[PDB]
Amino acid sequence: MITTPLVHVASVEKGRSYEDFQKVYNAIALKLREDDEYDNYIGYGPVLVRLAWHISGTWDKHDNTGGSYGGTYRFKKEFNDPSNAGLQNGFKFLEPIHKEFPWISSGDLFSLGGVTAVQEMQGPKIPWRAGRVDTPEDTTPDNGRLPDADKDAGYVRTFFQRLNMNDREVVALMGAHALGKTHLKNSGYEGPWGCANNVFTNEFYLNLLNEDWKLEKNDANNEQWDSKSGYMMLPTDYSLIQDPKYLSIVKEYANDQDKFFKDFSKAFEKLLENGITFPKDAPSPFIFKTLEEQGL
Ligand code: HEM
């Protein structure tokens, strides 16, 4: 025995088109607007984006294991990954939604939520594609493919390689750290990254470059970069600044929100599609209208 990389073919939910997804979208979107009290009124947007990434983040380019495709997060093994501590809130918010549209696969719904959360938070438009098919439980990836936080630029670069992401991709995607914040209880990390943490903007790069960062120890006994302004950064975050390579992307993005959003949009979609072979007859990526765009 030899390891051919699996091949995952996207098969659109039987009989669904643009209009159906848009509906899933608006639901998620409306429920975001409605459950505003979550996490100190930060809302469910950031967790939802955290959920889409972590479901895609199990991917291993070599043997085509993990990734969005299978919706394996719905299983225990994955669901209980110490790395996904806190994600249950997102699962919990997506549920009722899955009730209303039972016909959507899990990878599809989970991926779709992140996209929504992104657009709903005024970030860019992320072209999405349907077609992920739930896979059995044995197809769940063992715990541990998710990055550790107490590392450096070397680790982060080596890590992203497994997901086929390059430096510009890594920095673009990291910017999502402007959303939500760290909860000690989840991660051993505590605190926000900046002020506008439920509106997607380039705040993370700016902060990274303009604040006065100091390595301290949290109540969890780990080290984090604290700014006097009350923000924080992970070591992996602070590293985007020690690497010289990384550092000029950060500057470019802190300099142009615009580029930043294009770069992210293209990479986030990639993250969400890693591992899936879409047939050529497959349709194009949809691009959901936001509620606003819809007058809803
Ligand atoms: C080196 C890579 C990464 C590491 C080590 C890292 C780790 C972290 C940690 C530990 C937290 C706090 C979790 C908690 O305590 O609730 C966090 C939060 C989160 N992560 Fe990352 N992150 C990684 C990559 C990224 C990626 C690429 C994305 C999205 C594109 C991102 C999006 C988020 C967001 C939006 C949250 C906020 C979660 C919330 O507010 O509950 N992260 N991540």
CATH number for domain 6-146+268-296, candidates 1.10.520.10, 1.10.150.670, 3.40.50.300, 1.10.620.20: 1.10.520.10
Q: What is the spatial distance between Cα 132 and Cα 135, in angstroms, rounded to a whole number?
A: 9
Domain map (residue ranges) of the chain: 6-146+268-296, 147-267
Nearest CA to ligand 1 atom 25: 174
What's this structure's resolution in Å? 2.3
Q: Please indicate whether residue 183 is annotated as part of the active site.
A: no
129: CA distance to ligand 1 center in Å? 23
Q: Please indicate whether residue 8 is annotated as part of the active site.
A: no
Does the structural domain 147-267 have CATH classification 1.10.420.10?
Answer: yes
Nearest CA to ligand 1 atom 26: 174
Check if 179 has its Cβ closer than 6 Å to any atom of ligand 1: yes
- Which residues lie below 8 Å from residue 184, measured CB to CB, with a gap of 6+? 190, 218, 219, 220
Tokens of 213: 């960062």
